[PDB]
Design a protein around this ligand. Sequence first.
Ligand SMILES: Cc1cc(O)c(-c2ccc([C@@H](C)CN(C)C)cc2)c2c1[nH]c(=O)c1sccc12
Length: 296
Amino acid sequence: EEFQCLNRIEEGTYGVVYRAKDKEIVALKRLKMEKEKEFPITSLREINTILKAQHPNIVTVREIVVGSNMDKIYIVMNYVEHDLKSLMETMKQPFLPGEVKTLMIQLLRGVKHLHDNWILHRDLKTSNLLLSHAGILKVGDFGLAREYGSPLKAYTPVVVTLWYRAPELLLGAKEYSTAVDMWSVGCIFGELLTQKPLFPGKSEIDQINKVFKDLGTPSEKIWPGYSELPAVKKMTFSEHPYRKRFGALLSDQGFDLMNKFLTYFPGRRISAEDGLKHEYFRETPLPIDPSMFPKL
Ligand SMILES: Cc1cc(O)c(-c2ccc([C@@H](C)CN(C)C)cc2)c2c1[nH]c(=O)c1sccc12
């Protein structure tokens, strides 16, 4: 109604995003449908997070449509030219370090808005990252986003896509907050440099092994509460010592920033606010203007 679906874009979870026109090309997504009808809770949770997350580095919501006896719910949003995963598969040469810093600064600023507003996204991935022709980066999907409070409690155990899933979720952590989001940001950082996924594990066991092979095998000394972890209680993985795959590509401060991103201990994991304060973004390859981004 009121929109002509030009072409469906992609399917995520039970939600699907189309491309329509107003008079102006728009982006339209229908939220996940629920069997129980007695207003959908999952639809409301997605609506709440995306509204509170309204930010220049977040997708612009034009309208939200409900009706049909509350069976169908739609969210009208401004159409973005590209999604980041598409560029990775359709670029001849890797992103410049200045462009990477600009995208990371855009990403980190948007992440800080969510956490300051008690918002957890938990589904940070390249295909969920939208890049405009003008260099503006926005976050697209909120199908996993959820609110959290100061007194922490148990939430959704299995969250985040396996490739970007935090190790604590890979080890079945009962409580998690803001640590998984920063882990995904670190995973996206490595992908940008190499145009390839950082940890493309085939399964949860493979995902844990891939992380441990390069980042080493964590322990109680480097991670308090490792013994109490439900997975580590009845399991013991192979000890992998030491590995940098970005030789002569990432600066010394770049490695330090990445190490803080991919920190095994959630407490020692760098926050979004401290990420922007790292000297890597203030190094010799200064970030490039968003308006100066090359052609797509
Ligand atoms: C050019 C372009 C490509 C895309 O892959 C997506 C997009 C479509 C689905 C999702 C989620 C459900 C799930 N994805 C993992 C499949 C995320 C992004 C989008 C896009 N352009 C847009 O304007 C918008 S608005 C919301 C989305 C988009």
